[PDB]
Amino acid sequence: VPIPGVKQALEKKEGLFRKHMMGKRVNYAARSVISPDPNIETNEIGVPPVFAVKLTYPEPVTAYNIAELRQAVINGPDKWPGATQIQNEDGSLVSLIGMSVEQRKALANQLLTPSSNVSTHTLNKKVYRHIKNRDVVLMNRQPTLHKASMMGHKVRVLPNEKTLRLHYANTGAYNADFDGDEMNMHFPQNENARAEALNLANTDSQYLTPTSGSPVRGLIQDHISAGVWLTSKDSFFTREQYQQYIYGCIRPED
Amino acid sequence: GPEDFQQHEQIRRKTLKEKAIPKDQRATTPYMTKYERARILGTRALQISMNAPVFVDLEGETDPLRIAMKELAEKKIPLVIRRYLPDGSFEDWSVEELIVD
Amino acid sequence: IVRVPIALYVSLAPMYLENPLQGVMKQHLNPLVMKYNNKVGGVVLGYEGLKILDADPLSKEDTSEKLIKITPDTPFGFTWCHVNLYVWQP
Amino acid sequence: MDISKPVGSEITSVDFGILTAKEIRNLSAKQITNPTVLDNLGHPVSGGLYDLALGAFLRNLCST
Amino acid sequence: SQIWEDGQGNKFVGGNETTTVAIPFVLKYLDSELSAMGIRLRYNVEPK
């Protein structure tokens, strides 16, 4: 009822510190329901294609890039992997959303050209490519009650659905089930945060909780009973069964 | 005019060299910490992305972070880790002089 | 027609980490020629004896491999510089 | 944040002080006098709370 | 040549010793809300 004052604009959780500096709404994030997947590699996240077209990463072009950044610019904003925006040398932001295939082809032809303007002779164009498989992502599940509940996952871009796909080993860390829980996904935009999430916050490093040093990752239920069955004295397998099990679980091409 | 700035610059440099801990008596950990490794990789990746020269041969690679990990493997990253001390003093360790893991 | 020494705080691009002297020249000193500078007094015809400070003060000046402070958020490096500038005083 | 837009200066520290009434008028762009936020015609008045001095309001160039 | 004008044309001389830092915008809004309390914040720029 009372008209708020300046002090009431800063005082409590609804104020300004605890609501716009201690924590802020952020760009290049996504939220969705998690659904299980035992065919991802326990360090990866199954990214739906609906996110894979929106989330982008600024990639400056080079001589080692114009092989595939050019192809992404030719692919365009919808076909994945592709690019949405191109940032020019003098800061001009060009969008690929409305352009035609001829325009995209011409732009990607001019994606690496020498600069006649010497002011920005130290900069190269940046292409806002789609989130490919080599990228890294930062998962999160509120209430984030410990540092393990915010880890780094590599991205595996799945073709079908609109739920983020998670392996079963990432459940004791998030305290998560798969009965409608939703997890936040944050996509870092600079190489420093990339290397942070790959090395410091990555999920491989979070095997033991600092709380007591006990491990926090492992298979859960179906895999446990399957193991008790597979490793009993009654289990015998012919040559074909043995070789098929081993290859199916190993796959030396990856 | 310029005498005032020269005085300021001299005092700042004096404090700087008072804070630089000489190589003879730097007593921090010989190994490179995980945070140092992560940041060295990230900054080297940034430099390669912004067209800094690369001292290794790519296997036809295109991920700048992978290139940085390659250079760190071959010990070709020209960076220095200024390990600041709580008092403000610091030691300059080079990545070459630091052993990973 | 006088010569003015200058203390400079310039940004060195990552692309020039093999000839930092040329890099500082091309980024800042070349765009400072024949232009009225609000500090030195007026225009600049040229320069000579460019010298770059060092981020590690222990390294004596009898060296060529100087450290450059690197911006935390950016590959660009910042450091102090010294250079004699030839102006045309109004 | 763009990584091709380096920043030179940093905030090395901050201090708390009082904004004296002399410096406020020194740093001011306009004094507010009359509580005429928007008159008829749906526009701000000159010298009012939503003056063109305190910024560019709607499709109006800032008067400062 | 150290003078400059305003949009109202009331020109005056002032210090050009101004810089460019990287800050959140909520910092600027907080500084406004602090001016509304008669409280000034002095941010010291590391290179002077």
């Binding site: - | 005019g1 | 200058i6 800042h28 004699n84 | - | -």
Partner: peptide
């Protein structure tokens, strides 16, 4: 234009006109 990649952050004179 006139950004950190063309103009220096700060210019200081160390000596009066030589």
């Amino acid at each position: 234009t006139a950004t950190t990649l063309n103009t220096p952050v700060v210019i200081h004179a160390t000596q009066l006109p030589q």
